[PDB]
Design a protein around this ligand. Structure first.
Ligand code: 1FZ
Ligand code: MG
Ligand code: MG
Length: 430
DNA sequence: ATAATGACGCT
DNA sequence: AGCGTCA
């Protein structure tokens, strides 16, 4: 009753760019706008691998990870933009720079946590408090929420989707108690007004469209964001959670899309997130451990405490290249040349980082994958990063891995290497 | 033969 | 430190 926490203490948003790398290429090349379009890396093998897809192309069934030659079979008029290639590898600089454009705009509104190249969580609790003060006790007009969906509405006693959107919004606003500055539903609504403003600013200042979720925590905000992509935002209230979760597959919830989510399903014999409510916290802890158990117990009730961390910048700077199949590296000279290519890209990015962000990386992590091993990494080794010098970094990287080579002939490398990865870590102020 | 990344938990 | 998970 009066002591049961409801997880309604915060207003959190997740803003995610729509088909992000595609929009970056469409801004640059007007010929690609409003067309079925995809971004591809590496053209020679099967036309390249697709890493981003416009919504027009998605309607033909084009997806990420598809080969471009195959995507063209589904969508003969598909247009393609290629990722820049530098020093023999994909170079993602253009998309990193476009990411900064969007992150810097979001940071004007609130503390953000960069969660990927194209999304950030936003803690709007404070911003909402102040806007509520400015807004007297004035009603909130539907005109202030022109792209907002209220999940779960309309309900009760129109055949167009915009008609549906409005009806639900009307029911929501009609029910809202504006006199109470402490109403969680009110707080979420004001949060959504602010996110409309944020999303308009992003589009005005960059040309990029995005979607967003507004709820009381990160997991619900992220889930909400995806419910009405593209170019729309969704409010998921605490009250909407039982119905929303009642048919929500467990794998759709952030962090449950992998092996843990699968074991939840297998061990407990359930399918939907809401079904988790029937287990005691101790029961969930017994199956999945203390941390996962407690997290699941609260999360299936719509409650989560993970804070929006104040971090706009990546914690690591890395670059990697795979060498699949026949191309696996099999000579020492091959290994050294590619370590040099990676180290050169790293130096350039690190030097830029140091100038922009007043920090220096102090540790170098070297990772390789060996032929036959289907793990991401077969081996990780680290050394000190004391100089932003590509030749030193590549030399040092070789030094810490060179003993992996089981070959008798030292000019040869065995087993062949299917991946090289250099990562600069442990930043300190500079 | 998707690739290229990036955060974080466990021991 | 080095490995595993999730995205
Ligand atoms: C998931 C994923 C994304 N990306 C890149 C391309 C995407 O445009 C960008 C953002 O990822 P996303 O938000 O998961 N997908 P999207 O922004 O292209 O499309 P939407 O968010 O579903 O509208 O990151 C990859 O390069 N490999 C990946 O596995
Ligand atoms: Mg996106
Ligand atoms: Mg994203």
């Amino acid at each position: 009753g009066p002591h049961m926490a409801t997880g309604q203490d915060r207003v959190v948003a997740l803003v995610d760019m729509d088909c992000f790398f595609v929009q970056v290429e469409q801004r640059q090349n007007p010929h690609l706008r409003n067309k079925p379009c995809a971004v591809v890396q590496y053209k020679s093998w099967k036309g390249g691998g697709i890493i981003a897809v416009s919504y027009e192309a998605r309607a033909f069934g084009v997806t990420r990870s598809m080969w471009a030659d195959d995507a063209k079979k589904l969508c003969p008029d598909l247009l393609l933009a290629q990722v820049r290639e530098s020093r023999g590898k994909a170079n993602l600089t253009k998309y990193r720079e476009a990411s900064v454009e969007v992150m810097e705009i979001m940071s004007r509104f609130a503390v953000i946590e960069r969660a990927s190249i194209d999304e950030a969580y936003v803690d709007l609790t404070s911003a909402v408090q102040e806007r509520l003060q400015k807004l007297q006790g004035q009603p909130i007009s539907a005109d202030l929420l022109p792209s907002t969906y209220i999940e779960g509405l309309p309900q009760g006693p129109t055949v167009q989707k915009e008609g549906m959107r409005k009806q639900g919004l009307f029911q929501w606003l009609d029910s809202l108690q504006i006199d109470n500055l402490t109403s969680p539903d009110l707080q979420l609504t004001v949060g959504a007004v602010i996110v409309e403003e944020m999303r308009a600013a992003i589009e005005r200042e960059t040309g990029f469209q995005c979607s967003a979720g507004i709820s009381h925590n990160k997991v619900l905000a992220k889930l909400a964001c995806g419910l009405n992509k593209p170019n729309r935002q969704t409010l998921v209230s605490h009250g909407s959670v039982p119905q929303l979760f009642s048919q929500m597959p467990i794998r759709k919830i952030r962090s449950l899309g992998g092996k843990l989510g699968a074991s939840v399903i297998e061990i407990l014999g359930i399918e939907y997130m809401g079904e988790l409510t029937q287990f005691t916290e101790s029961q969930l802890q017994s199956h999945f451990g203390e941390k996962n158990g407690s997290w699941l117990y609260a999360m299936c009730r719509g409650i989560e405490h993970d804070p929006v961390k104040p971090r706009q910048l990546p914690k690591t700077i890395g670059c990697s290249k795979n060498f699949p199949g026949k191309t696996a590296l099999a000579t020492r000279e091959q290994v050294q040349w590619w370590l040099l290519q990676l180290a050169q890209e790293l130096e350039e990015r690190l030097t830029k980082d140091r100038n922009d962000n007043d920090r220096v990386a102090t540790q170098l992590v070297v990772s390789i994958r060996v032929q036959g091993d289907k793990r991401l990494s077969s081996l990780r080794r680290c050394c000190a990063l004391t100089r932003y010098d590509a030749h030193k970094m590549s030399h040092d990287a070789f030094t810490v891995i060179k003993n992996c080579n089981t070959s008798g002939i030292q000019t040869e490398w065995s087993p062949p290497l299917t991946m090289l990865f250099l990562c600069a870590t442990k930043f300190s102020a500079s």
